[PDB]
Design an enzyme around this catalytic site. Structure first.
Site, short mmCIF file in Angstrom:
data_model
loop_
_atom_site.label_atom_id
_atom_site.label_comp_id
_atom_site.label_asym_id
_atom_site.label_seq_id
_atom_site.Cartn_x
_atom_site.Cartn_y
_atom_site.Cartn_z
CB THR A 158 -0.93 0.06 1.21
OG1 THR A 158 -0.24 -0.42 2.36
CG2 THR A 158 -2.16 -0.83 0.94
CG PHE A 178 -3.73 5.11 7.59
CD1 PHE A 178 -2.76 4.28 7.14
CD2 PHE A 178 -3.55 6.47 7.36
CE1 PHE A 178 -1.70 4.76 6.36
CE2 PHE A 178 -2.49 6.95 6.60
CZ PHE A 178 -1.57 6.14 6.11
CB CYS A 207 -3.21 1.46 9.56
SG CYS A 207 -1.58 0.98 8.86
C1 HEM Z 1 -0.15 4.03 2.97
C2 HEM Z 1 0.04 2.77 3.37
C3 HEM Z 1 -1.01 2.02 4.18
C4 HEM Z 1 -2.36 2.00 4.08
C5 HEM Z 1 -3.26 2.87 3.15
C6 HEM Z 1 -2.84 1.04 5.03
C7 HEM Z 1 -4.19 0.83 5.32
C8 HEM Z 1 -4.77 0.07 6.30
C9 HEM Z 1 -6.20 -0.14 6.53
C10 HEM Z 1 -7.29 0.58 5.77
C11 HEM Z 1 -6.32 -0.99 7.57
C12 HEM Z 1 -7.62 -1.48 8.23
C13 HEM Z 1 -8.08 -2.76 7.56
C14 HEM Z 1 -9.48 -3.19 7.99
O1 HEM Z 1 -10.22 -2.48 8.73
O2 HEM Z 1 -9.87 -4.32 7.56
C15 HEM Z 1 -4.96 -1.39 7.96
C16 HEM Z 1 -4.59 -2.24 8.94
C17 HEM Z 1 -3.35 -2.76 9.16
N1 HEM Z 1 -2.20 -2.33 8.63
FE1 HEM Z 1 -1.96 -0.73 7.29
N2 HEM Z 1 -1.75 0.55 5.73
C18 HEM Z 1 -0.62 1.07 5.19
C19 HEM Z 1 0.66 0.76 5.58
C20 HEM Z 1 1.01 -0.23 6.51
C21 HEM Z 1 2.32 -0.56 6.99
C22 HEM Z 1 3.60 0.14 6.53
C23 HEM Z 1 2.17 -1.58 7.86
C24 HEM Z 1 3.24 -2.31 8.64
C25 HEM Z 1 4.47 -1.88 8.85
C26 HEM Z 1 0.74 -1.89 7.99
C27 HEM Z 1 0.14 -2.91 8.75
C28 HEM Z 1 -1.18 -3.10 9.05
C29 HEM Z 1 -1.61 -4.08 10.03
C30 HEM Z 1 -0.76 -5.13 10.75
C31 HEM Z 1 -3.04 -3.83 10.10
C32 HEM Z 1 -4.00 -4.61 10.99
C33 HEM Z 1 -4.02 -3.84 12.34
C34 HEM Z 1 -4.92 -4.56 13.32
O3 HEM Z 1 -6.12 -4.82 12.95
O4 HEM Z 1 -4.45 -4.90 14.44
N3 HEM Z 1 0.08 -1.01 7.22
N4 HEM Z 1 -4.08 -0.69 7.22
C1 LIG Z 2 -15.77 -6.25 -3.24
O1 LIG Z 2 -14.86 -6.42 -2.12
C2 LIG Z 2 -13.61 -5.84 -2.02
C3 LIG Z 2 -13.01 -5.46 -3.23
C4 LIG Z 2 -11.76 -4.88 -3.19
C5 LIG Z 2 -11.10 -4.67 -1.97
N1 LIG Z 2 -9.88 -4.15 -1.68
C6 LIG Z 2 -9.73 -4.25 -0.36
S1 LIG Z 2 -8.33 -3.70 0.43
C7 LIG Z 2 -8.34 -4.85 1.73
C8 LIG Z 2 -7.14 -4.69 2.64
N2 LIG Z 2 -7.21 -3.71 3.61
C9 LIG Z 2 -6.15 -3.45 4.44
C10 LIG Z 2 -4.95 -4.16 4.38
C11 LIG Z 2 -3.83 -3.84 5.34
C12 LIG Z 2 -4.81 -5.25 3.40
O2 LIG Z 2 -3.66 -5.91 3.23
C13 LIG Z 2 -2.73 -5.18 2.39
C14 LIG Z 2 -5.91 -5.55 2.48
C15 LIG Z 2 -5.72 -6.67 1.45
N3 LIG Z 2 -10.80 -4.82 0.29
C16 LIG Z 2 -11.71 -5.11 -0.69
C17 LIG Z 2 -12.99 -5.69 -0.75
#
Ligand code: HEM
Ligand SMILES: COc1ccc2nc(SCc3ncc(C)c(OC)c3C)[nH]c2c1
Length: 450
Positions: free
Chosen positions: A263, A388, A395
């Site tokens: 990402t 995030f 995140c």
């Molecule tokens: C611009 C870059 C990034 C974006 C846009 C991003 C975005 C997100 C989003 C949207 C979630 C929530 C997912 C959900 O609710 O299902 C998430 C969770 C997470 N991200 Fe990121 N992330 C980024 C970079 C990173 C980096 C650099 C790391 C690790 C070094 C990381 C590790 C994780 C982890 C481990 C979670 C799960 C946290 C938890 O639920 O305990 N992410 N991230």
């Molecule tokens: C139709 O359903 C969809 C389609 C695309 C989608 N793209 C996403 S983004 C889902 C996502 N979010 C956060 C992290 C940290 C992650 O690991 C990199 C992923 C795979 N969710 C979707 C669900």
């Protein structure tokens, strides 16, 4: 009120709308047509897509909604396991790993990653200094070399040596196919047709590639630090007094290797895209970079001074958040928006790029790239800007991503002038996550020593 729904295909309901290489972009076009909420049905499944800040601020109320594993994350779970991204909040290993790994993202931990970020960032600057006249740069390919290498080095003291390779690293090639496969599965009416047997074999081969690299990282550390991997192997949860087990640790490594670079590579790619398409913005970012980055390499405090560069990144995340959706489930019966009743267990999807184009929050110019929108962040209402995720399941790497991206972008702008020599037409490739595909630029060195 009754919620809108897009066109249906008899018994397949809405499922054939996901038969595209660009499902998020198709969902955004549905939302433009149908508004702030719509229902999306598949055989045996319903989900509701939210696009307005009005409703999404309710969905972000953790007394009413918890993180859901979307179908996407369920499929990624086959190789992420009960790692942090793909664990339910109620599973024992979510809170335990969370507690164990949190210290890896303190301000002091970030200060200790900085030098390693610099090492990779210098390798990118030098690759580009060393290109001959009229050679060009494959933007997302090089961002991926930088971000994969940064997470390998900072998190695991492992060198992917991506910049020593002309092709993408084999770990990437397998990651992209597994993610592709997870996305493609979203559209399958009959997932166990024999026609998919070969996809299943490739998927398993790609998982094996990822896992043998994980084994190598684990082997190397045992053979050889105070980094993410140290904490994974040794740290104890203050609540239970237990360390992670072996199986969960391997899932964390895969999890962090992918979420910890893919990402960020997208973000840096989009940010450069917007900069080359907005020359007055690029100029203002370049002028801050020059003013702030006075030393041969950047220091931690200097990276923190790059305010306008920070804003550019947030504005790229506003338009194209690179993990573009997250999902929630209703903890009890409840009414959304005072108009849409939900039963316990009902699923919501937050369509982040649409949230981020909500004209009631951002004004009518929502398609413009204007980093100045983030000049005074206080003025943004709650839950308007969510690249995030939300709440306790937000995140964990947010500051890591932004520091890295700010460092690297600051250096790029200090050291080169960029040209969109092809007049590139934005083409967004989807692999659950979003990246520009085919984006190329030329960079002319300013010959500032490094
Ligand atoms: C611009 C870059 C990034 C974006 C846009 C991003 C975005 C997100 C989003 C949207 C979630 C929530 C997912 C959900 O609710 O299902 C998430 C969770 C997470 N991200 Fe990121 N992330 C980024 C970079 C990173 C980096 C650099 C790391 C690790 C070094 C990381 C590790 C994780 C982890 C481990 C979670 C799960 C946290 C938890 O639920 O305990 N992410 N991230
Ligand atoms: C139709 O359903 C969809 C389609 C695309 C989608 N793209 C996403 S983004 C889902 C996502 N979010 C956060 C992290 C940290 C992650 O690991 C990199 C992923 C795979 N969710 C979707 C669900």
């Amino acid at each position: 009120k009754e919620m809108p729904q897009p066109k249906t295909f008899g018994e397949l309901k809405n499922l054939p709308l996901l038969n595209t290489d660009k499902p998020v972009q198709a969902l955004m076009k549905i939302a433009d047509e149908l508004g702030e909420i719509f229902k999306f049905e598949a055989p045996g499944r319903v989900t509701r897509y939210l696009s307005s800040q009005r409703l999404i601020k309710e969905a972000c109320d953790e007394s009413r909604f918890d993180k859901n594993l979307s179908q996407a994350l369920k499929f990624v779970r086959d190789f992420f396991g009960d790692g942090l991204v793909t664990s339910w909040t109620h599973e024992k290993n979510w809170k335990k790993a969370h507690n164990i790994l949190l210290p890896s993202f303190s301000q002091q931990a970030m200060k200790g990653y900085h030098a390693m970020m610099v090492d990779i960032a210098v390798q990118l600057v030098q690759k580009w200094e060393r290109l001959n006249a009229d050679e060009h740069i494959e933007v997302p390919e090089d961002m991926t070399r930088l971000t994969l290498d940064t997470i390998g080095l900072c998190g695991f003291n492992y060198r992917f040596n991506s910049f020593y390779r002309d092709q993408p690293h084999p770990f990437i090639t397998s990651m992209v196919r597994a993610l592709d496969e997870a996305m493609n599965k979203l559209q399958r009416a009959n997932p166990d047709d024999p026609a998919y047997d070969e996809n299943k074999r490739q998927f398993q081969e790609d998982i094996k590639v990822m896992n043998d690299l994980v084994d190598k990282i684990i082997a190397d550390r045992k053979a050889s630090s105070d980094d993410l991997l140290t904490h994974m192997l040794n740290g104890k949860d203050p609540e239970t007094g237990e360390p992670l087990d072996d199986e969960n640790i391997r899932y964390q490594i895969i999890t962090f290797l992918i979420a910890g670079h893919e990402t960020t590579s997208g973000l840096l790619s989009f940010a450069l895209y917007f900069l080359v398409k907005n020359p007055h913005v690029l100029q203002k970012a370049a002028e801050e970079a020059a003013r702030v980055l006075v030393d041969p390499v950047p220091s931690y405090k200097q990276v923190k001074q790059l305010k306008y560069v920070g804003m550019v990144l947030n504005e790229a995340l506003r338009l194209w958040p690179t993990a573009p959706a997250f999902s929630l489930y209703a903890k009890e019966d409840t009414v959304l928006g005072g108009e849409y009743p939900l039963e316990k267990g009902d699923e919501l999807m937050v369509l982040i790029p649409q949230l981020h184009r909500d004209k009631t929050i951002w004004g009518d110019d929502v398609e413009e790239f204007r980093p100045e929108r983030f000049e005074n962040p206080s003025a943004i209402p709650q839950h308007a800007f969510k690249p995030f995720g939300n709440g306790q399941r937000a995140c964990i790497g947010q500051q890591f991503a932004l520091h890295e991206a700010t460092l690297v972008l600051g250096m790029m702008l200090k050291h080169f002038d960029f040209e969109d020599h092809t007049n590139y037409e934005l083409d967004i490739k989807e692999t659950l996550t979003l990246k520009p595909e085919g984006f190329v630029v030329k960079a002319k060195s300013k010959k500032i020593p490094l």
